[PDB]
Amino acid sequence: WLSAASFQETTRVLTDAAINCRSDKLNGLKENVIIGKLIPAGTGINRYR
Amino acid sequence: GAMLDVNFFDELRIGLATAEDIRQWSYGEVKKPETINYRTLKPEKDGLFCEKIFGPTRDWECYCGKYKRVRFKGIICERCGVEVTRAKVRRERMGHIELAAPVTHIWYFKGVPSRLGYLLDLAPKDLEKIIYFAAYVITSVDEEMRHNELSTLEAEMAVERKAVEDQRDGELEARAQKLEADLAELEAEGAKADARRKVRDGGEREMRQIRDRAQRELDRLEDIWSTFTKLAPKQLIVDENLYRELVDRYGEYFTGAMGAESIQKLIENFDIDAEAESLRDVIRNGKGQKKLR
Amino acid sequence: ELSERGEKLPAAQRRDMMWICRDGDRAKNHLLEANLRLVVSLAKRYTGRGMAFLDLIQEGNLGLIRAVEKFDYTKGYKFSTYATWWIRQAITRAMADQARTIRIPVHMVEVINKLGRIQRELLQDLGREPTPEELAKEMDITPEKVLEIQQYAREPISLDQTIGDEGDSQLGDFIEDSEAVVAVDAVSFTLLQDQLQSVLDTLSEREAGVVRLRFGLTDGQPRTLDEIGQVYGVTRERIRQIESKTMSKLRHPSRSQVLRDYL
Amino acid sequence: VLRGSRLGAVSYETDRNHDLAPRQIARYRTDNGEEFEVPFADDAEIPGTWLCRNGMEGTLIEGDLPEPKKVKPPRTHWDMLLERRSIEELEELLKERLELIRSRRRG
Amino acid sequence: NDLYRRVINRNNRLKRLIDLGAPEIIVNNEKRMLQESVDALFDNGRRGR
Amino acid sequence: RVVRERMTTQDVEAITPQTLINIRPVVAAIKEFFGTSQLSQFMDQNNPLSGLTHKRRLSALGPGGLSRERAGLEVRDVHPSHYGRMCPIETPEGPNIG
DNA sequence: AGGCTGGCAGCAGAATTTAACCGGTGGCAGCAGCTGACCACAACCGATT
DNA sequence: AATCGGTTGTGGTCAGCTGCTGCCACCGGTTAACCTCCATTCTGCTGCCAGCCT
Ligand SMILES: [Zn+2]
């Protein structure tokens, strides 16, 4: 939900992420940029890190 | 889970905050529309910038200056109530406003598709009229009392309509007496043969309009009776006068309200499992606009 | 009063009285509903300065409730004659309380409106914007009081308005936070703490302890000479004398050259 | 260049955790049964009532203080009526209304 | 602060009207105004001007 | 509007034009046109050509005319009725071309 | 005799007018009247090497 | 002879309440001829009305 709300239609995405009580496992490349940790690509993966 | 946010997050979960969540996040109720003093430029108590609610403006001081170091850290001044701590807690502490009447959230009422309308099965036009105080809605009805007093109330309505028609019969007799007086005072005196019929035509117009008044009043009584016999919850009553006649005659057997307090009573009397089961039966069996809806 | 300490009345009389008790409330509601249109026509004059139209109507309705309560029918006047005073007072006092973000009280709003009328009359009849001396002589106050009132009469600008014309940049993106950590003052204070601790460390133990407990360099609490004297078992004047001699030692160039740059 | 200050101070101290002043904890109770803990200073007089986080006053939990009294409104509709009428005039008005409703219903 | 102040002003006036015992025309007009002010706080211009 | 509004209150045969007229809205209207409007611009003074070309400028945008994002690609064109009336060459090259 | 379903058209969201008294109370603000502790210059001691 | 600590004669001194004595902001209540209503494009949903079926 956190990378779909920042794409577009923020109000519509947030108003049924709340109704469905959605949870965000922060797996993506954009959710790690927003919350401020290492993206899961490049040198930020556990093989290299 | 975490609230200080030291960076071991596993998940971020979103949901729908209830009133207990809101008044559990809050550090105090704001109850004045004041911001700062116009002379001393310092925050006002209970206002929108209050230090007793949101924390102090200066690092490790209270509001009255009684406690002013890190030696007094974490205590609350017994005079002004300001907890002496950092001033950056005024970016972290929330407060709340306790409403005197319930209010709907605009996100769940307005934006297409209306989620409140889908849950309660009300059209958005019929939902706007309720929550913006333009129509009534039947929150509850009583079926046992209605089914056991329907005959007696039918007898009462028939008695009252009989009285109305007897009143029209008395008017029929009185205007017939005036009409026969007009006959005796027009046919036995010399005038125009058409002008003796103009007064009786006005009398017949008076009879037509008076029986039209009686017919419209009888139609209004039939409308009240049919509206009470077809009463169910989630049913809009525009015509404030029709609603007032209903609460006058049959003030038991049902309840009604306007606004978000009626919307929240409809949500209280809502059976999510039964509604989901009936919707799944429709999508298994039926077809068309019913199945798509 | 009768239902206080019991005293049961006849039930016919009790049913008789309750009818007029509810009829009084019906009458009061009828009077208010009849004069709501007067409230609206009276309140439409104040639209356009701060408050919205429906807020003005509702504060007028509170005033109309008090005009119903204080109305005396034996004086033989109309209701609207008496109620116009209370409706106008309620609308004007509510506008004084609720028009601005930073709230100015009613008496100061009254002198601001007075100064506004005076200034408009002088600009009309003088052909020129009047001086503070002319305003202060027309209004019988001092020429600095005019400027204090005129600076209390200023409304805030908005942080969220577009200050550009094409870049779509708001005002709040142009205001420097003048209370953030400057990140070189915060490290200079750290190195000052370390250097001051070194210079104090190269004195004697009790001589450094006297200065540290005197200036509160350990716990932020500057103690007094008698407290340090009972700490070290010494008297107040001897504490003051050794403090003066340590200040003489610390004022040396060999100690203060490394600290001159930190001022 | 615009430069503004939200009118507060920022102090440069080391936030320690050990040498801190002593505190005592009171406990209050509002009229719907909620309970709150307030850390006062040890050398300080604990107040009788405290405005808590619900925005409603809560009394101190220890049964010592006979403090709250009546602060009654001197302005009700009955008071505003009484300052412009008399008891005999109101009694006459009441008896005239009673006689009218007797003549209406009973007659 | 203006949107929050509208909510607090209309809420306090509604408390005054309810404890004053005003007729339902006045009380319902106050409730409808309180509802529209909270709507304008959350999403301004979504419903109305 | 203020003339009518304070014409109804004041007693007739006691009023005069300088008691009816409040010139403060006229003064404020002219003042807020000349400062803070889109079409009242800071004069381009680099050289005499910048100055002379800031006058003799026909701008299609402003209060009462079309926006920049909501303007179509058809009003940004050169039309054969511009011959002798508007220059086909001299126009901005940014997002204001035409 | 009625009815419930098919296109069909319209609408919403998202992207690039007017003032004044009067009472009363809490906060302010300034200033002797003590202070009561602080500061200090100078002088007078209590053993002690 | 000094030297580390007390005693203090005595003279300012310096702010900390303490009355105290105005005095000045601040807030509530009152006023009684009479006059009563404010750009374009795409997508999806919702309501409209004819048209075959029992
Ligand atoms: Zn404090």
From TrEMBL, chain E:
Signal peptide stretch: none
Protein role: DNA-dependent RNA polymerase catalyzes the transcription of DNA into RNA using the four ribonucleoside triphosphates as substrates.
Family membership noted in the UniProt record: Belongs to the RNA polymerase beta' chain family.
Complexes and interactors: The RNAP catalytic core consists of 2 alpha, 1 beta, 1 beta' and 1 omega subunit. When a sigma factor is associated with the core the holoenzyme is formed, which can initiate transcription.
Protein name: DNA-directed RNA polymerase subunit beta'
Source organism: Mycobacterium tuberculosis
Gene: rpoC
